[PDB]
């Protein structure tokens, strides 16, 4: 702000406090920082404790540090010598604190290295010369000679450990400049002083102050999270130190460079370095785009270097050759999620039983990274191959005897996402829909998806398939066949019999969508009466309580359904044949209706609570019998006098925007003339 | 020792439901074979209805003695509290499933549009890269570059160590 440099020009007690508070509120600009350090260094009337308090509490940059600020600072870090006596000596504690503040925030590398020979600066120059050395060509034997000469020099304190840290960084960086580990051996072998040097503190209170100031500073220029990440990685680089006419692709540093020398660009065969992963532009600044640049410079074919690299590093992951099979798997996924030829090659060479046996976790990850984006090149033969692959993985999962193994279901969810991507395009939609029907056939087999050994993975895959069917049925512009929206009766009645409320909601959603599509179709076809059978069976099982009077329920005649009720003892025989065949009698929706009833009691602040833990006609009648005079006046849900009205009031609460059970309420409100007015 | 009791009754109920399911399957196929002579080659459309009648018998029994225990709240038997614990952990996670599924489906749509954009970009850049033309003493040059490096480093050393008050990036 203008208050800061106004105080600065005034200084050319109250001004100090104003400068402190305006720095704590705004922070100085780079010319303001230049003027402040120029005023602070040149004069000596200001107290030294106030000088270090300023450099530790007042210098707060707002944006980029310009080169002129560094050049002005470097002018003040010098010492009086035999060729310069007119300038006064800057206090060494002020120089050390300024270098520490620099830690807090090819020529310049030599500038900082020649300042490293100062004894009092060595405790803070070392992170700067570590962070300056980012490339192998930066180091040189003259730098090594100077570092060793000053390290083994007597009269110093921090030189051995810190210079050993510098040499360790150089050894970790270049792998050249003939061996210098024996030079490290010549320097101290205590592993204690450089152990304390390798972790450095930056006064995290001041870091938080600068964090809040910089967050108050420019939008989309230094956000807080990236600043914290950059500071953390700069500290971790210190921490983990224990262990010409044509232009190469490495030396390209900016997007401007690629333009004028694209026909003069030489792509190197250094695939491992450029595929395996900073304010300075260097070779690693543009490492993201290298994989695409190779496939642009060399025309796409199944012989290019990134394709071979992905294939080899995936075979290494499958063969348990790599120590960490989670550092290159995201790289392979990011490269091969696009670029259809590589993904199709990976699918052809890896999606089978043989590589499933080797490692199913990495196969599951590559199926999550490749399958949802794949679009086939040859339509014929894809369906048979995918049926073979899904059958192989299903036998592999089911021979184990453990129903917890969810790899088949997870890969099924992935291939339903592939079917989503396929049916988003109007072409090859029949292949995707037939593959969806095959997946529905595999998901509903009673080896993983049972009524005793549950598997919510299979239910998630099934409701994903039903969601994709509902989203497919809303597309009028695509002239798909009518037979590809039914899944047969044998799946629908089975999943109606299943006790999963989300799955029943998805089934009701599928019925609602397919009827709204089938309304324009003729009223008497092979599948219209099939949908009519579906909705009449589901409505009879859900609301009507007329199962025994029907011809059949889910393909089963009600005589067997009654004979199961025979020899099935119930403690009270008031209403046995209609007690538990309703919305409150469904195994997945029994206690849900009780939760909804309790929430309705809580919302209306009713003094009466439904003490019985089951909603049926007998319990409803007994509940009105025990508290008749209280029910008659006030203290319960309004507008309800019978069990049917209670079910309607429950259905109102299930239609609210708070539950994942919208579709059952809409199904009952749609195909019931009594409930058609509640839509 | 109560946790041991709950663990024990857990594998007992797992083996119980397993043996009852396979017992029902064996009983129904035994009825099929005893009514026939050797008819065991029944189609998928019949095995599925066998699975359907198994499933409805299972959940009908579950609801049947769900009627027996939850009709009158005794609030003293520990099996009762086991039922409320099981129910309250069953119905808790229902919304988050559909929320995560919808969010990841929107993510998949983002993948689809990003892939389409990158396919277009690669197509355009392959078309452009085929239109560019093909790609096409130094003894004193390396010596004068070495001389430049030595002179500039000596200049840096003389500017720093002599206390000269204007350090600048001199090319």
């Amino acid at each position: 702000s203008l208050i800061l440099d106004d105080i600065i020009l005034s200084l050319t007690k109250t001004t100090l406090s104003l400068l402190y508070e305006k720095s704590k509120q705004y922070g100085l600009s780079s010319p303001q920082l230049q003027a402040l350090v120029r005023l602070l260094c040149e004069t000596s009337i200001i107290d030294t404790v106030t000088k270090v308090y300023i450099v530790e509490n007042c210098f707060l940059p707002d944006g980029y540090l310009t080169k002129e600020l560094l050049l002005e600072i470097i002018n003040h870090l010098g010492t009086p010598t035999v060729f310069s006596r007119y300038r006064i000596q800057t206090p060494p504690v002020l120089q050390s604190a300024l270098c520490k503040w620099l830690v807090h925030v090819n020529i310049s590398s030599s500038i900082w290295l020649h300042l490293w020979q100062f004894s009092f600066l060595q405790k803070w120059i070392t992170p700067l010369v570590i962070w300056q050395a980012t490339t192998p060509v930066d180091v040189k034997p003259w730098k090594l000679s100077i570092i060793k000469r000053c390290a083994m020099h007597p009269g110093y304190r921090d030189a051995p450990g810190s210079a050993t840290l510098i040499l360790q960084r150089f050894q970790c960086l270049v792998g050249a400049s003939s061996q210098i580990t024996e030079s490290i051996i010549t320097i101290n072998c205590n592993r204690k002083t450089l152990k304390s040097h390798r972790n450095l503190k930056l006064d995290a209170h001041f870091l938080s102050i600068l964090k809040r100031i910089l967050s108050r500073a420019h939008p989309a220029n230094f956000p807080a999270d990236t600043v914290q990440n950059t500071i953390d990685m700069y500290l971790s680089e210190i921490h983990q130190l224990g262990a010409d006419s044509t232009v190469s692709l490495w030396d390209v540093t900016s997007l401007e460079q690629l333009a004028q020398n694209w026909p003069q660009l030489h792509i190197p065969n250094d695939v491992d370095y450029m595929m395996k992963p900073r304010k300075v532009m260097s070779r690693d600044s543009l490492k993201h785009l290298y994989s695409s640049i190779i496939l642009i410079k060399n025309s796409r074919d199944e012989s290019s270097s990134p394709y071979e690299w992905c294939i080899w590093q995936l075979k290494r992951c499958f063969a348990h050759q790599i120590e960490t099979p989670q550092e290159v798997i995201p790289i392979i996924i990011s490269v091969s999620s696009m670029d259809n030829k590589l993904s199709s090659r990976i699918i052809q060479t890896f999606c089978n039983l043989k590589y499933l046996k080797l490692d199913e976790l990495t196969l599951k990850k590559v199926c999550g990274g490749i399958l949802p984006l794949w679009k086939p090149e040859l339509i014929s033969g894809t369906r048979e191959f995918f049926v073979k692959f899904m059958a192989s993985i299903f036998m592999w999962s089911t021979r184990d005897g453990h129903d917890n193994n969810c790899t088949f279901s997870e890969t099924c969810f992935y291939v339903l996402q592939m079917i989503t991507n396929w049916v988003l395009d109007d072409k090859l939609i029949a292949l995707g829909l037939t593959l969806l029907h095959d997946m529905q056939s595999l998901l509903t087999l009673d080896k993983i998806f049972n009524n005793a050994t549950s598997n919510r993975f299979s239910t998630m895959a099934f409701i994903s398939s039903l969601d994709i069917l509902t989203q497919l049925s809303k597309q009028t512009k695509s002239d798909y066949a009518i037979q590809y929206l039914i899944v047969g009766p044998d799946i629908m009645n089975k999943v109606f019999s299943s006790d999963d409320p989300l799955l029943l909601s998805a089934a009701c959603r599928y019925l609602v969508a397919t009827k709204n599509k089938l309304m324009q179709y003729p009223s008497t076809n092979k599948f219209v009466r099939m949908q009519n059978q579906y909705i009449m069976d589901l409505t009879n099982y859900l609301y009507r309580n007329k199962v025994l009077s029907s011809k059949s329920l889910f393909g089963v005649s009600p005589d067997f359904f009654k004979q199961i009720l025979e020899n099935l003892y119930i403690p009270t025989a008031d209403f046995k044949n209609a007690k538990f065949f309703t919305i409150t009698g469904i195994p997945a929706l029994s206690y849900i209706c009780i939760i909804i009833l309790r929430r309705l009691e809580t919302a209306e602040n009713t003094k009466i609570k439904f003490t019985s833990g089951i909603i049926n006609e007998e319990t409803f009648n007994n509940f009105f019998r025990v508290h008749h005079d209280e029910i008659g006046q006030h203290g319960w849900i309004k507008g309800v006098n019978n069990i049917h009205d209670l079910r309607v009031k429950i259905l109102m609460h299930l239609s609210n925007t708070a539950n994942p059970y919208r579709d059952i309420a809409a199904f009952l409100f749609t195909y019931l003339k009594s409930l058609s007015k509640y839509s | 020792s109560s946790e041991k009791q709950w663990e024990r009754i857990q594998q007992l109920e797992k083996e119980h439901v397993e043996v009852y399911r396979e017992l029902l399957i064996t009983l129904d196929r035994l009825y099929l074979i005893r009514k026939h002579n050797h008819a065991v080659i029944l189609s998928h459309t019949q095995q599925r209805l066998l699975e359907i009648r198994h499933q409805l018998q299972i959940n009908l029994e579950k609801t049947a003695l769900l009627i027996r225990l939850l009709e009158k709240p005794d609030n003293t038997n520990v099996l009762f509290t086991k039922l409320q614990n099981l129910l309250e952990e069953s119905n808790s996670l229902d919304y988050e499933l559909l929320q995560s599924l919808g969010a990841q489906s929107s993510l998949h749509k983002q993948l689809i549009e990003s892939r389409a954009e990158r396919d277009e970009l690669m197509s355009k850049l392959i078309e452009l890269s085929s239109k560019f033309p093909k790609p096409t003493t130094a003894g004193k040059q390396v010596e004068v570059e070495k001389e430049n490096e030595t002179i500039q480093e000596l200049m840096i050393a003389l500017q720093i160590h002599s206390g000269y008050t204007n350090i600048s990036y001199t090319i």
Partner: peptide, 15 residues
Amino acid sequence: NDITQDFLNLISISS
């Protein structure tokens, strides 16, 4: 198609 559907029916029988 028919061979694939019969193969799925074989899976269902084998399940």
